[PDB]
Amino acid sequence: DVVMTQTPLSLPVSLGDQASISCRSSQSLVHSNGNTYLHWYLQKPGQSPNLLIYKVSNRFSGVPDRFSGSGSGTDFTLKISRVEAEDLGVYFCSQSTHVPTFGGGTKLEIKRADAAPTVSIFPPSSEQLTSGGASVVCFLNNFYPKDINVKWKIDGSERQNGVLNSWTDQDSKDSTYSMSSTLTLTKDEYERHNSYTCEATHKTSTSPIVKSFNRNEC
Amino acid sequence: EVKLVESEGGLVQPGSSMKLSCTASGFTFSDYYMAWVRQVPEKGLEWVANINYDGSSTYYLDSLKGRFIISRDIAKNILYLQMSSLRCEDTATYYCARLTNGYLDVWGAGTTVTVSSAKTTPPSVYPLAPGCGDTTGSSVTLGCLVKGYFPESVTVTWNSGSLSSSVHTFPALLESGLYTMSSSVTVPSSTWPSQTVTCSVAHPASSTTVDKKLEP
């Protein structure tokens, strides 16, 4: 069972700089027939993998020379020169000399200047309330870096349980991320309190960004 | 052009069976080996099976215990994966792929298979609009909250896809046995509600599409 080990797990690179990704195999990938079946694929956000490099160093049709594969035996490297934003996604190696296996992937992150989130809060819809539920949503849009904290308060009290936080992949358009935070309560509990607040902590601000509403004003 | 398109996946009860298909075009079908691979959540990609030109020789991931069958119809340019006695561990995104000289040079779009005794449930789609007496600037952010569905996946578009430039779609999360996801869009404030905005949520598993108009 041949293990393909990739490093690093995530690689941040500035536009126009070079990225270098390592792929190592637990067994030599030199087939008895002399060929080394080590390949590289790229999976962009929301897409299927596409072939990038086959048999160590051969660029697949349509892949620019910026992408270069090298190595031998058990040690392989993918180098991406002059990185462009559209290069972002998960790069993974694979071997088919032996029973075929895949590496775990390396995520290429594009660096950009820090960008503050735009935070929007929404109360439960009347449609949801009619059905007996109550979710409060905060969107945190277009920020960088990806690390961000959201804290929900109900009448001033932090609430941890019932929170669903979901990040987008990085957008090649502007190198930013967005995330959605949803606090799901029962209508019973929602109707007993008044103040609903989401607080966003991000490195772009010393003080958290606070969005809030009062239920009886909705 | 070259392309591979998988059939719709979806929900199957543990212990039951199901068959995926994949249709090829643009190349001489029988001039290529074909393969299935799967992407298991929180795990990597894994080989499933491959088949030679005429289907006389196949290979399977060992752990499958012969529960899966790969086959191909030369008359129809179609690749099959029959799956039997499904277990939770078979839940994954399945891709069909063209295999050439040891590598996969064309990949399908992927199809999601969910092994579960839970029931198919359509999404509730809730509008997210500003209010609560807040004021209005030069833009407005609107959204849809897509809750309570099973299995994955859903697709969300805005105005039948004609609104796309300012859209963010957030990956689904499982909570209490059901999925929740959301989507936001931003438009100039002078244009809403004057120019309508609707989120359309398609959920193939329940054969349902919701086209929810955003209201102030």
Binding site: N33, Y37, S96, T97, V99 | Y33, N101, G102
Partner: peptide, 9 residues
Amino acid sequence: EPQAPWMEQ
């Protein structure tokens, strides 16, 4: 000629 090299014997 081979398309699935690991199947070679």
